Amino acid sequence: MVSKGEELFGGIVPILVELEGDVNGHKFSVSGEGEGDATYGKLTLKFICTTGKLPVPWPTLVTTLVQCFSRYPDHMKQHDFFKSVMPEGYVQERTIFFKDDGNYKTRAEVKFEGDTLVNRIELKGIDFKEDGNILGHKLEYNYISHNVYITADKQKNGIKANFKARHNITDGSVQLADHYQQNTPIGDGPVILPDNHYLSTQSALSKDPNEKRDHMVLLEFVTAAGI
Numbered sequence: 001m002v003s004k005g006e007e008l009f010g011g012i013v014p015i016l017v018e019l020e021g022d023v024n025g026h027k028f029s030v031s032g033e034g035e036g037d038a039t040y041g042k043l044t045l046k047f048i049c050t051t052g053k054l055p056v057p058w059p060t061l062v063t064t065l066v067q068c069f070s071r072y073p074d075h076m077k078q079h080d081f082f083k084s085v086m087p088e089g090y091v092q093e094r095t096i097f098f099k100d101d102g103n104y105k106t107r108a109e110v111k112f113e114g115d116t117l118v119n120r121i122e123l124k125g126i127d128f129k130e131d132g133n134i135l136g137h138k139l140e141y142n143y144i145s146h147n148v149y150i151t152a153d154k155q156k157n158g159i160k161a162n163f164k165a166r167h168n169i170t171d172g173s174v175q176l177a178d179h180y181q182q183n184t185p186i187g188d189g190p191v192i193l194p195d196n197h198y199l200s201t202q203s204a205l206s207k208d209p210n211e212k213r214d215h216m217v218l219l220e221f222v223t224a225a226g227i
Contacts, residue, residue, distance in 0.1 A: 003083070003084060004086070004087070005083040005084050005085060005086040005087070006077070006080070006083050006084075008083070008087055008112065009038040009039075009068065009069070009083055009086075010038075010039070011037070011039075012035050012036070012037050013036045013037075013038070013069075013115070013116075013117050014033070014034075014035050014116045014117070015032070015033065015034050015035055015036050015043070015045060015066060015069075015116065015117050015118075015119070016031075016032070016033055016113075016116050016117075016118045016119070017031065017032035017033070017045065017047065017065050017066075017118075017119045018030075018031055018032075018118075018119070018120050019031075019032075019061070019064065019065060019121040019122075019123060020121070020122055020123070021056075021122075021123035021124070021125070022124055022125070023056050023102075023123070023124075023125030023126075023128060023134075024055075024102070024125060024126065024127075024128045024130070024135060026055035026056075027051070028049060028051045028055055028056075029049070029051045030047050030048065030050065030054070030061065031047065031048050031050055032045045032046060032048070032065060032218075033045065034046060034218075036066065036068075036069035036117065037069075038068070038069045038070065038071060038083070039071065040071060040221070041069070041070055041221045041222045041223045042069070042071075042220070042221055043066065043069055043218065043219070043220040043221075043222075044218070044219055044220075045065075045217075045218045045220075046208065046211075046215060046216070046217045046218070047061075047065060047215060047216045047217075047218065048211075048213045048214070048215045049215065050213075052214065053214055054214050055135065056125070056134050056135070056137075057133075057134060057137050057138075057139040057141075057167075058141065058205065058216040059139050059141065059142070059143055059167050060098075060104075060134060060139065060167065060177065061123075061216075062143060062203060062205075062216075062218065063094070063096070063165060063177075063179060064094070064096075064104070064106050064108070064121060064123060065119070065121070065218075066110060066117060066119050067082045067148075067222070068082035068083050068086060068110065068117065069117075069222065070082065070199055070222045070223065070224050071221075071222065071224065072224040073224065073225075075227070076197065076224050076225075076227050078192060078194075079192065079194035079195055079197055079227065080192060080194070080224070081158070081159050081183065081191060081192050081193065081194055082110075084190075084192040085185040085186070085187065085189070085191055086111070086112060087112035088111060088112075088185070088186050088189065089109060089110050089111025089112065089185070089186045089187070090109075090110055090111075090158070090183045090184060090185050090186060091107065091109055091184045091185075091186060092106075092107075092109075092110060092182075092183045093105075093106065093107050093108075093181065093182050093183075094106045094179055094180060094181045094182075095179075095180045096177050096178070096179050096180075097177070097178045097180075098128070098132075098133070098134055098175060098176070098177050099175065099176035099177075099178065100132075101127070101128055101129055101132045101133060101134055101175075102125055102126055102128030102129070102132075102134065103125065103126065103127060104124065104125045105123070105124050105125075106121060106122065106123045106124075107121070107122050108120060108122070109186065111186060133167075133169055133175045134175075138169050138170050138171070138175075139167045139168065139169060139170070139175060140167070140168040140169070140170055141205055142168065142204075142205055143167075143203040143204070143205055144166050144167070144168070145200070145201065145202045146163055146165060146201060147163065147198040147199065147201065148161050148162075148163040148179075148181075148198060148199040148201055149161060149162050149163055149196070149198050150194060150196065150197055150198060150199065151196050152193040152194055152195070153182065153193075154193060156182070156184055157185060157191060157193075158183050158184040158185065158191070159182070159183045159193070159194065160180075160181065160183075161179070161180075161182075161183075162179065162180055162181065163179045163181075164176060164177070164178055164179070165179065195227060196226070197226040197227050198224070198225055198226045199222050199223070199224055200222065200223050200224075200225050201220070201221075201222045202220065202222075203218055203219065203220040203221075204218070204219045204220075205217070205218060206218075206219070
């Protein structure tokens with residue numbers, strides 16, 4: 001079989017991201033657009049903070065701001081939950097614990113609206129230190145590689161994932177962000193529940209020389225592995 005879900009991802013797909021956040025009562029909104037090419041694990045997006053200055057570092061929002069665009073090798077296609085649930089989509093939830101600082105909780109719905117794959121996110125951050133690495137913007141504007149470890153959750157008709165992002169601090173240290181994730185389908189239909197595997201993820205952060213708003217240009221490649 002080649003599912004409806006997979007076929008949606010065969011060429012270039014327009015992407016729209018909308019995020020509403022509140023971190024320590026600092027309210028903010030982010031929009032992004034661009035496109036995905038899952039054949040190549042490829043994402044190209046630009047994000048704008050629509051409310052002025054982003055109160056947190058951009059690198060901290062990367063994981064929150066469409067794993068359905070992962071390149072799953074042919075031999076691992078029966079393990080691709082994300083695409084399996086499309087076009088109806090999935091709920092993605094996380095808790096991100098910044099070591100020695102606060103945490104984000106996120107809830108997102110990822111789904112097709114017509115031809116556009118949409119990521120709608122609510123983010124809530126508490127317990128942050130006002131002149132910590134996050135609210136004091138002490139994180140370097142780059143990103144590291146890491147692997148995202150994916151396991152089935154039979155008891156929820158979904159998946160769980162775990163991973164550590166390590167953000168460089170401007171003094172040369174590292175700020176650990178320990179991610180705990182769950183995804184459930186939005187619809188009632190069948191889903192692939194995968195064997196354990198990982199997503200090998202990389203991103204490059206850059207700026208648009210003409211853009212006056214606070215923003216982030218992102219180029220990202222993700223390939224599934226470990227089977």
